[PDB]
Amino acid sequence: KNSELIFIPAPGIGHLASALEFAKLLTNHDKNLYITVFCIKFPGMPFADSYIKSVLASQPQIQLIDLPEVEPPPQELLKSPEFYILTFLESLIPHVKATIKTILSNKVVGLVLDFFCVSMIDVGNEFGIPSYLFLTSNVGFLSLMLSLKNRQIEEVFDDSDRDHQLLNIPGISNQVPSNVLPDACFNKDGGYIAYYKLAERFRDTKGIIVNTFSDLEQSSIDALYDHDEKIPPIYAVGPLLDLKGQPNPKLDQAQHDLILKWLDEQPDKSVVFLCFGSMGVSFGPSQIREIALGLKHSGVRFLWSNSAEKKVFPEGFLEWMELEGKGMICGWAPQVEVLAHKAIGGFVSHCGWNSILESMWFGVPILTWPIYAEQQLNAFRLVKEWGVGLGLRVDYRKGSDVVAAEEIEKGLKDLMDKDSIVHKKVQEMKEMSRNAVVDGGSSLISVGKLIDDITG
Amino acid sequence: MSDINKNSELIFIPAPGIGHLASALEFAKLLTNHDKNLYITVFCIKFPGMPFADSYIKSVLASQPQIQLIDLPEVEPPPQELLKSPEFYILTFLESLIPHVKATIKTILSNKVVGLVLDFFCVSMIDVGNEFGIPSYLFLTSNVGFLSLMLSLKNRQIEEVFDDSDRDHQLLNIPGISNQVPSNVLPDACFNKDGGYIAYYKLAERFRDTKGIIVNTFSDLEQSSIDALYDHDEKIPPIYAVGPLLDLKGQPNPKLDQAQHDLILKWLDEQPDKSVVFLCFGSMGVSFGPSQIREIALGLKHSGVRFLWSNSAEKKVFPEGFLEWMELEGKGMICGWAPQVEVLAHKAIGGFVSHCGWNSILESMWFGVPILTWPIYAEQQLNAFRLVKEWGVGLGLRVDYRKGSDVVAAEEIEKGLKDLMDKDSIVHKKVQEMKEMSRNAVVDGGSSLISVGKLIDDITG
Numbered sequence: 080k081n082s083e084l085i086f087i088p089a090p091g092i093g094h095l096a097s098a099l100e101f102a103k104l105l106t107n108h109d110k111n112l113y114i115t116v117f118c119i120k121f122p123g124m125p126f127a128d129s130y131i132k133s134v135l136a137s138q139p140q141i142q143l144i145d146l147p148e149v150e151p152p153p154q155e156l157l158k159s160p161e162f163y164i165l166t167f168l169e170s171l172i173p174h175v176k177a178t179i180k181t182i183l184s185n186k187v188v189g190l191v192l193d194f195f196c197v198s199m200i201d202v203g204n205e206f207g208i209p210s211y212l213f214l215t216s217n218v219g220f221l222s223l224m225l226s227l228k229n230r231q232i233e234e235v236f237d238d239s240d241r242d243h244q245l246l247n248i249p250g251i252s253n254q255v256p257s258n259v260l261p262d263a264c265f266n267k268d269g270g271y272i273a274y275y276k277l278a279e280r281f282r283d284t285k286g287i288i289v290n291t292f293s294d295l296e297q298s299s300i301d302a303l304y305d306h307d308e309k310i311p312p313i314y315a316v317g318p319l320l321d322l323k324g325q326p327n328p329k330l331d332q333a334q335h336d337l338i339l340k341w342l343d344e345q346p347d348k349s350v351v352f353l354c355f356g357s358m359g360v361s362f363g364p365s366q367i368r369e370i371a372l373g374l375k376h377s378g379v380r381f382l383w384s385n386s387a388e389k390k391v392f393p394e395g396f397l398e399w400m401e402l403e404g405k406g407m408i409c410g411w412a413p414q415v416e417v418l419a420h421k422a423i424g425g426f427v428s429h430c431g432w433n434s435i436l437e438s439m440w441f442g443v444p445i446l447t448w449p450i451y452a453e454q455q456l457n458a459f460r461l462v463k464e465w466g467v468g469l470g471l472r473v474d475y476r477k478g479s480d481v482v483a484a485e486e487i488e489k490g491l492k493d494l495m496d497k498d499s500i501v502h503k504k505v506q507e508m509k510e511m512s513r514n515a516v517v518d519g520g521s522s523l524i525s526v527g528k529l530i531d532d533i534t535g
Numbered sequence: 536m537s538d539i540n541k542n543s544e545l546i547f548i549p550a551p552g553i554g555h556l557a558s559a560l561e562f563a564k565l566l567t568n569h570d571k572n573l574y575i576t577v578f579c580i581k582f583p584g585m586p587f588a589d590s591y592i593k594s595v596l597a598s599q600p601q602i603q604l605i606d607l608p609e610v611e612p613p614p615q616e617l618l619k620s621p622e623f624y625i626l627t628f629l630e631s632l633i634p635h636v637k638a639t640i641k642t643i644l645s646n647k648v649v650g651l652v653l654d655f656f657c658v659s660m661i662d663v664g665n666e667f668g669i670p671s672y673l674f675l676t677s678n679v680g681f682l683s684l685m686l687s688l689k690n691r692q693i694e695e696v697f698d699d700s701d702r703d704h705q706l707l708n709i710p711g712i713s714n715q716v717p718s719n720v721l722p723d724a725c726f727n728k729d730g731g732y733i734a735y736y737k738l739a740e741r742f743r744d745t746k747g748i749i750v751n752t753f754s755d756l757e758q759s760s761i762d763a764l765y766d767h768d769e770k771i772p773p774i775y776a777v778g779p780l781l782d783l784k785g786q787p788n789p790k791l792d793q794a795q796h797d798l799i800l801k802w803l804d805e806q807p808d809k810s811v812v813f814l815c816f817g818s819m820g821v822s823f824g825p826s827q828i829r830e831i832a833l834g835l836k837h838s839g840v841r842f843l844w845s846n847s848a849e850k851k852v853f854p855e856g857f858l859e860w861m862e863l864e865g866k867g868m869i870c871g872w873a874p875q876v877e878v879l880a881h882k883a884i885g886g887f888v889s890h891c892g893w894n895s896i897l898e899s900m901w902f903g904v905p906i907l908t909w910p911i912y913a914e915q916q917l918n919a920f921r922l923v924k925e926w927g928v929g930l931g932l933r934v935d936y937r938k939g940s941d942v943v944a945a946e947e948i949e950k951g952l953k954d955l956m957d958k959d960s961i962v963h964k965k966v967q968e969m970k971e972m973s974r975n976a977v978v979d980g981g982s983s984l985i986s987v988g989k990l991i992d993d994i995t996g
């Protein structure tokens with residue numbers, strides 16, 4: 080009674096980890112379920128067969144297969160990250176098809192695709208294999224995507240003309256402003272194209288699985304259904320977290336120890352952790368200097384993760400940290416290990432989905448600073464829907480003016496203020512997020528139904 | 536007989552505040568200095584909510600037997616909520632004074648009165664002038680470039696406002712302006728949809744109803760521009776280039792006492808020749824945001840150049856330890872208001888970061904000082920564009936900066952400064968040639984003095 084699923088995730092951090100965690104989650108709930116993961120090399124850069132294979136504790140039911148590398152797109156499409164990936168992935172079609180045929184057996188029960196790989200549904204179709212969608216984001220994002228059915232092909236959401244006009248999208252309860260919409264929605268350079276080409280097929284999958292939980296978004300899932308029947312079942316099976324923590328870019332831990340030892344010396348819940356995603360979107364010098372001054376004036380202790388050159392900081396800043404020791408800067412960080420630390424009391428996040436889920440898992444309040452993509456949307460809903468985060472910005476993006484130290488300092492104080500409201504809902508979101516994946520929890524129930532539908 | 540036939544009188548109604556007033560008085564003197572029988576009466580538009588009182592003027596018009604000042608009933612200013620566009624706020628104001636202009640005129644009218652000399656923003660008086668058979672003369676405190684844009688507005692109705700979204704490679708050709716002027720350099724008023732574009736129109740529309748247009752510029756600077764204005768529209772009244780009209784002494788102001796005035800200049804004295812950079816962004820008091828201030832402060836330090844920074848900002852706004860450093864090494868100094876011409880004339884100044892107001896540019900050219908352009912409001916953007924792309928007498932930091940622009944970072948400022956102060960800069964040689972030309976304009980036999988002669992002859996003819 081063996082069943083096999085083919086997993087084709089997208090290259091990255093917030094797209095590969097949760098993918099494997101999902102593989103482990105499923106195989107843990109069906110001894111007879113085996114999974115093949117097609118490891119695809121993101122244009123040259125690592126993050127491939129080193130992490131996807133390391134986390135692979137030889138898990139018997141999870142196999143790894145490397146697809147040969149390919150000539151990335153014309154480095155011209157970089158104008159649009161979205162349109163860049165969509166093209167690179169579509170170029171992997173011949174190989175994808177090729178590889179499936181080579182391992183296809185009457186035991187292959189379906190393909191599990193990342194949102195950016197949803198175009199490959201036509202390959203599975205050729206082999207009579209149903210395809211499932213794996214969204215590393217939330218249901219609100221799905222809705223935004225599922226809401227584009229009422230669009231054209233040449234247009235580009237508001238035609239890049241956004242200001243203060245509200246949009247009504249089935250899925251999110253609150254009216255959604257234009258400024259929280261992802262960058263691709265306005266990217267008339269292939270950005271809107273990609274989101275459209277991809278969202279086109281959502282309703283063509285056998286089921287859509289989402290890295291979220293019921294207590295957090297059942298209301299939207301029910302609204303998506305209630306609003307449309309052509310939509311396949313949705314499976315909330317999250318959170319899907321890598322509580323272990325990606326080893327690299329840490330071959331050893333010389334610095335890994337520095338960060339934790341430093342946090343071990345701070346008063347409980349006094350530190351605010353700032354970190355802005357894996358990509359490492361480095362803010363310009365001005366923004367860095369302003370965030371630095373903001374931090375000093377605020378008086379809060381802090382662990383700031385960034386990739387800015389030392390000379391960029393305001394004069395006196397670095398000395399002041401290494402002397403008064405109220406703060407510290409570092410490059411790549413053990414985010415999960417950090418958020419797990421008891422000294423942490425606040426998080427200035429870019430609002431990537433995982434960062435938000437990990438933060439909720441540990442009951443750490445968030446001061447929002449979205450940057451690229453659906454981050455604004457996450458930020459928007461975080462502050463004005465689930466009330467678990469304070470807003471510094473929710474419409475910020477690559478192009479906005481610099482955020483002044485004054486604003487930052489204010490947000491900082493509000494976020495660390497113990498009597499703020501944000502601290503309340505947070506502990507509740509922690510309970511909920513954690514009761515979601517225990518036996519009897521809403522996500523484990525979903526896993527069973529998903530595995531049942533997959534192998535029935 | 537009895538010289539009665541020669542006497543003549545002019546009525547001066549300029550716009551409020553320096554930048555507009557200073558040019559008006561210096562023009563009154565130039566004229567009165569060239570016709571011992573021409574008398575001028577200046578209407579002091581007593582702006583409600585502005586310093587420049589009779590204290591400023593009566594300083595320059597002291598001992599000028601041919602010039603008298605007459606105040607007007609300080610009428611309640613228009614609603615501060617119409618200030619959504621400065622331009623429109625002013626036009627509305629100056630127009631609420633007409634009743635007083637017409638009243639005052641009646642009280643001092645005579646048959647000697649040969650004309651009305653009004654400020655660009657006061658062209659609405661032309662009619663009051665006609666109510667007395669008095670022709671009106673337009674005195675433009677800006678340059679022929681600004682005239683060229685203004686006169687080009689008649690090529691579009693009073694509603695089809697310049698596209699406030701497509702200012703990129705959407706170049707606009709403006710008669711009078713040689714270079715293919717961009718749209719990002721067009722004044723805000725051109726894009727303001729709340730009284731802005733309207734004002735620039737209701738005012739410009741009247742430009743052609745004047746006996747002549749007097750510009751504070753000189754022939755060696757824009758004769759090509761002027762020639763181009765006639766070749767295009769055979770209805771533009773005569774243009775008289777009579778500048779530079781500068782107030783080289785500079786009048787006092789509470790914002791700068793003797794001590795300060797003294798320390799500033801004594802300080803400059805200790806500085807090496809052409810080692811200091813002056814930074815001044817107008818009199819309008821238009822101040823920068825905290826973040827931008829800090830960026831300028833860091834940019835100045837990293838650049839290693841001496842400096843004199845005029846600005847109003849709390850000490851709690853500057854980079855920590857910036858002021859201590861400043862007054863510790865004395866490599867820079869900060870003042871509130873500044874004796875700008877005294878400074879621009881001081882041997883130590885080697886560069887000027889200016890918001891590009893016209894008087895400032897003119898003073899900077901007079902003293903052969905290079906400017907690093909940082910336009911902000913009004914027509915400053917166009918002035919900076921021509922300052923860089925046309926006359927090549929200045930360097931661009933930002934030729935399109937305006938209300939709502941990203942903060943200009945220290946790295947960019949630093950690099951702009953080092954270039955400004957570069958001994959071997961193509962502009963340096965062009966600046967001294969400009970300095971020379973602007974000064975000959977007003978020596979006997981100069982284009983401007985020859986020009987003021989035909990003007991006075993025209994007015995009193």
Ligand SMILES: O=c1ccn([C@@H]2O[C@H](COP(=O)(O)OP(=O)(O)O[C@H]3O[C@H](CO)[C@@H](O)[C@H](O)[C@H]3O)[C@@H](O)[C@H]2O)c(=O)[nH]1
Nearest residue numbers: 093215356357358411412414415431432433434452453454
């Ligand atoms: O210094 C760092 C930065 C990140 N992380 C980890 O990296 C992951 C970051 O994932 P996420 O928060 O989702 O951010 P990104 O991958 O940078 O963001 C992209 O992918 C997310 C998942 O789809 C989307 O929600 C975002 O909008 C999209 O920009 C998390 O597990 C973090 O713990 C670290 O360990 N250290």
Ligand SMILES: O=c1ccn([C@@H]2O[C@H](COP(=O)(O)OP(=O)(O)O[C@H]3O[C@H](CO)[C@@H](O)[C@H](O)[C@H]3O)[C@@H](O)[C@H]2O)c(=O)[nH]1
Nearest residue numbers: 554676817818819872873875876892893894895913914915
């Ligand atoms: O601290 C200071 C600041 C200014 N000034 C003097 O003030 C005048 C400034 O005139 P200008 O450079 O023209 O600036 P503004 O008056 O602030 O600017 C408005 O008026 C100008 C004259 O029309 C226009 O060209 C500009 O675009 C418009 O913004 C000059 O004579 C300066 O020497 C000082 O003496 N000390």
